[model samples]
Target: PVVIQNLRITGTITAREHSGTGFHPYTLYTVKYETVLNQQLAYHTVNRRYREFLNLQTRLEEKPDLRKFIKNVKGPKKMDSDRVEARKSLLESFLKQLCAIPEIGNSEEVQEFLALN
Candidate 1:
């Protein structure tokens, strides 16, 4: 019997506005996955800020070989709920596209992005 591994950048969670000193509110997207590597199977969830996704995109786009994989998905410039919701689906689509590419998905960039390392 074989169990197929599944990986997904599922949904988003918007944090309530914070007024505490030295703290800023933000939204975190939920990343869920099951992966098999080196004869081991693992499942985990990672919560990531939108900026983190930009960081990964920037890093991966630095390489000539991986450059073409960029989705360049538009992220909302404002923090409105409607805009955030719109960006959520695009971000999920962007991540899925990136993960579907073996060259990009299997790289250390994505490994760290998904907190798989």
Candidate 2:
């Protein structure tokens, strides 16, 4: 009936330690991206893997004007979150800052990230 933004996306990221044999040998950086708009004092935690971020990148690059603004997107070289931050913390911070700006936030890539549709 009316048009308004009803979705808010936020995330908590940490370089977590994984049990190398959880899935008989599963290790990877984990992310909990939250969406809260249909409720209050509550966050719907969602599991988004490394590939999702990789997908976001493809969307971001769809626009040359936008892509040029991004220096680069980095992913951990290993399958685990063992080393991040100085050398590997790049992705978390990069996406955070990029989504902080209104212009960048409204980009096609971010819109998809927010799942407006």
Candidate 3:
């Protein structure tokens, strides 16, 4: 059977640090996935299970307090080469995991799943 296995996913990763006072540097990762065919099948099967692990609400907005600290930084110049490289590595690893999925072929159920998310 001819099959169409196409997936499109994109996201960003950020590393942060506080220079003044008793603060430390840390890495934070955020990823978002959008599929063209089998969205809800995974959502009902896998996403639901993982959602419990994360306790994430469906309508949650992306807002992190550390964003202020990020704005204060001196832009790309302020970041060390090693730190920038690390973030790239992290994003690559995340994309690998996010894109790995079994093909579901063409189905009304799968199409509906893809449409919702």
Best candidate per lDDT, number?
A: 1
Deviation of model 2 at 94, angstroms: 2.2
For residues 2-92, could you state the per-residue lDDT of candidate 1 as single tens digits? Answer: 2224656677787755576655668888988787666888778989987888888888778878876654544323259897667777777
- For model 3, how does the per-residue alpha-carbon lDDT over 20-74 read when each residue is reduced to its tens digit? 7666645333333333353342321112122221222111112243233223222
User: In candidate 2, what are the lDDT values of residues 2-106, reduced to their tens digit?
Assistant: 122322223345444446755333223443344344453333233345656677767666778777666554533324446434433555665555565555666
Q: If the candidates were sorted by their TM-score against the true structure, best first, what order would they fall in?
A: 1, 2, 3
Q: Which regions of candidate 1 are displaced past 4 Å?
A: 1-5, 9-21, 37-41, 71-82
Task: List the RMSD of every prediction in angstroms.
Answer: 4.8, 7.7, 15.8
- Determine the C-alpha RMSD for candidate 3 after optimal superposition of all C-alphas: 15.8
lDDT of 2 at 29: 41
TM-score of each: 0.69, 0.48, 0.25
Better of 1 and 3 by lDDT: 1
Name the best candidate (by TM-score): 1
Candidate order by lDDT, highest to lowest? 1, 2, 3
